[PDB]
Design a protein around this ligand. Structure first.
Ligand code: PIO
Ligand code: PIO
Ligand code: PIO
Ligand code: NAG
Ligand code: NAG
Ligand code: NAG
Ligand code: NAG
Ligand code: NAG
Ligand code: NAG
Ligand code: NAG
Ligand code: NAG
Ligand code: NAG
Ligand code: NAG
Ligand code: NAG
Ligand code: NAG
Lengths: 283, 283, 283
């Protein structure tokens, strides 16, 4: 039967058309919900992890001040013994020197030394830094450092000063002591704001290790700073609005609501007929 | 047609009534599920973050023991250089002194100094504390401290002693060393128990910094304790039962199940008619 | 009416049969989705917490090297003052000594001392370790340690060497300094891979505390290492694929999709009749 086959194929096509129409309606309702959500402030946010084979190269903005960088080197899961503490050399890191006004206190300019961070988390790649300071007039010996998402973004940024101020606004600033080697295991946390930008903040697990110096007492006045940066785990924590992070839950809820509405329509159509029949039988 | 319009509006009203009835049934089923869940112990819990513009003022319960508080001051994202280490003055913090019996070991009473914590996370507000100890007979120089949810709750609590014991039961106790300035970046984690109470625990990221003292050798016997408390990020981690944390997923699942049951009812109504017709045709 | 009751009970049985068939179809579709997901690499993973009354005993693999273990003891929420620093005795921990080749650098063999960790988190059980080293030729004084999921698994493992290499592959290695007592608050994080194995990694919150020594200057050459291990909180972080972690969301979405397809089928059946009637009326 050619007519029967034509009717069947047209019915299948109409099934496709109505399924597409329902999908479009659900998508429009979900987009309306998202647009209404993004307006309100402080929404409930969910957590999602995503393992990465290789990390993007981060930026480690040091603040030596009067301290001089002594040595920078990349290593894998082990630190070879130092040839001679307090001596320069063996320095090759992608270091960019920029200094700018502090966004918090506009009166002070801070000198930032940005060093490209490790990126092969699987190989336990780490970066070892050494600093020296002959004379210091301060109660506490420390160097400030903050971590931002990517070194490449800073390198190719059009407004370098503003990018560093935005990084200062981010909550990823710490310190490492003098006379100690601190192993910093940094973790990446990405949060997506409602406006669209993805703010990035870091989490660290320091391991302070005392440094024993056999150098002559003449050079004991100078203090040596050591720090090691390494990725703790390949997993990247992602924070996003609970509705937007997993839209499939909202889609399922909306489909359930629409199907419930249609079932209620069918129930009303049956019930009006039933009550009309009852009224006709009674009177 | 007045009758047609009346029938249509009555049908819409009946749609509303049946939709409300379905919502009530789904709500009752969800409440039954929640009541059954809350009985079982150790449920699977989810994680939700919620950014806050301003933090509630926390309580930092120090345990100086023989140590004397030297100076307390609130600062913003920077610590001014100390005028004179080891000297009192410039002390203004909301400090409440209470001491009580240890819930773990009832034989020992512990002296707790509670200091109101920072609350403007956006401005990077921080609290700086100094302690002094002339003579000490101990292998390790440290001061215990634990953090609870709100200082105001402790201040207006009816049973002060019991509140501190409950805080001791909470897992938010740490230490900071002597001769070092430790920057404590505390994070708030709220977990909601099945009974209804919301237990609060803290997460910290210390940054130990060595302290260099130029004071005369006569006063070197006394040891100085420094600590800084600051909120790491405005986000507050919230932990709740997976079913209760996002009830919309359970509501969607229940609506889907009810609609599937109704579809099965329709399928049975069609299939019984089909098989009756088949049986009548055959015999 | 016996016939009416028989028809009703048969209709109920057919309802059960069709509900079971729908459940089987949804289960097959969900299993297909899971099998397709598990093939792709780097999926989005969710976070679930689960409180435990008691922890499984972990394994703390120390790396003293030339250092000699001085004392091991289990305590509850308090460390009694040391009877005499630098002296052995009071040693009773379940310690297993194994040494093997480093998976990263095959040329070096590492000596591992595994100590059973605390398990009563509710009682704040902790393990205190002491180490001694007379002569050392190294710039930094530290002992490596890594934490794996269970001590019992290592104890009864058939291939001990391979298990330790797998633990080394896990990202749970840290250090503790010399001359300081570091309080390690370890947290358990379980991640389930797509292949099926559950990798385990740890998170720690160290609390470095300076150690004051009154021992005679003759013995000051030797350095003493102190470390304390304790569970931070009973909650265990579990990381799993977002689809697999909460299958109920996927089941609800699939049921909604199938019900939407059936509703589209009904709409097509009505619309074809409506358009056929319209065409017949027109021509
Ligand atoms: C419409 C069917 C049911 C959808 C409910 C599904 C929407 C949904 O899941 O909202 C939870 C959320 C709770 O707020 P929250 O503090 O968690 O963010 O609600 C709102 O506050 C704004 C809703 C946006 C306004 C919704 C406008 C429709
Ligand atoms: C009823 C339709 C389907 C609902 C399923 C939706 C209910 C649901 O999501 O439960 C998952 C949970 C898994 O336990 P879990 O260890 O994850 O907690 O189940 C239970 O153990 C208790 C269920 C409470 C008992 C449920 C009583 C109905
Ligand atoms: C079929 C009805 C709708 C199901 C959608 C529900 C399936 C679902 O939730 O997928 C989200 C996920 C997003 O990928 P993701 O990066 O988050 O992992 O999709 C895929 O990439 C693979 C899907 C597996 C392939 C799905 C094959 C059906
Ligand atoms: C290492 O340093 C040398 C200069 O001493 C430089 O030419 C080389 O590119 C550096 N390699 C890396 C990977 O930094
Ligand atoms: C950085 O500081 C120096 C002075 O130390 C001065 O040249 C100017 O403020 C900045 N210059 C550079 C190199 O950006
Ligand atoms: C500091 O300088 C900046 C420059 O933009 C300005 O916006 C800010 O108001 C100033 N704050 C003061 C006056 O302390
Ligand atoms: C510090 O002292 C060393 C000693 O050799 C000297 O070479 C160097 O120029 C001095 N300046 C700094 C701060 O590096
Ligand atoms: C600061 O200290 C003075 C007393 O020296 C006190 O009157 C004032 O209220 C304090 N301010 C704050 C904010 O603590
Ligand atoms: C706190 O301790 C003191 C003794 O140091 C004693 O008065 C009593 O135990 C407590 N008193 C206060 C001030 O609560
Ligand atoms: C310690 O004293 C408390 C007071 O309530 C009591 O409950 C507990 O059993 C005591 N523990 C002992 C006797 O060690
Ligand atoms: C500690 O020593 C200082 C030295 O001036 C003295 O003023 C003070 O009374 C002593 N007592 C304490 C523990 O503060
Ligand atoms: C404590 O040490 C003794 C030997 O000195 C041993 O017999 C006993 O089993 C140990 N107890 C524990 C719990 O380790
Ligand atoms: C561990 O090391 C020792 C040498 O210190 C040697 O016997 C062998 O390499 C290993 N032996 C044991 C006890 O496993
Ligand atoms: C180190 O030895 C192991 C033994 O299995 C081997 O697999 C690996 O390739 C070696 N790496 C080298 C040659 O550096
Ligand atoms: C270290 O010195 C102590 C001093 O009594 C001695 O007993 C011991 O045998 C020496 N060896 C080690 C490394 O323990």
């Amino acid at each position: 039967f050619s007519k029967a086959c034509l009717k069947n194929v047209f019915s299948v096509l109409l099934i496709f058309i109505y399924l597409l129409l329902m999908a479009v309606a659900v998508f429009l309702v979900y987009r309306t919900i998202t647009d209404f959500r993004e307006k309100l402030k402080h929404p409930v946010m969910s957590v999602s992890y995503k393992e990465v084979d290789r990390y993007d190269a981060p930026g480690i903005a040091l603040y030596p001040g009067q301290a001089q960088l002594l040595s920078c080197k990349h290593h894998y899961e082990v630190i070879p013994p130092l040839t001679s503490p307090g001596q320069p050399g063996d320095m090759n890191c992608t270091t960019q020197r920029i200094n700018y006004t502090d966004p918090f206190s506009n009166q002070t300019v801070k000198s930032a030394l940005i060093v490209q961070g490790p990126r092969e988390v699987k190989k336990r790649e780490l970066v070892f830094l050494q600093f020296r300071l002959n004379k210091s007039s301060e109660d506490f010996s420390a160097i400030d450092y903050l971590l931002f998402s990517s070194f490449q973004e800073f390198l190719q940024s059009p407004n370098r000063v503003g990018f560093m101020q935005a990084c200062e606004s981010a909550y990823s600033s710490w310190k490492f002591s003098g006379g100690f080697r601190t192993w910093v295991k940094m973790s990446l946390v990405k949060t997506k704001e409602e406006d669209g930008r993805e703010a990035v903040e870091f989490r660290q697990e320091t391991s302070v290790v005392n440094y024993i110096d056999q150098r002559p007492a003449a050079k004991k006045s100078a203090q040596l700073f050591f720090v090691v940066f390494e990725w703790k785990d390949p997993f990247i924590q992602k924070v996003q609005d609970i509705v937007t992070a997993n839209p499939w839950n909202t889609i399922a809820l909306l489909c359930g609501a629409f199907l419930a509405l249609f079932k209620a329509a069918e129930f009303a159509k049956l019930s009006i007929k039933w009550m009309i029949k009852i009224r006709k039988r009674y009177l």
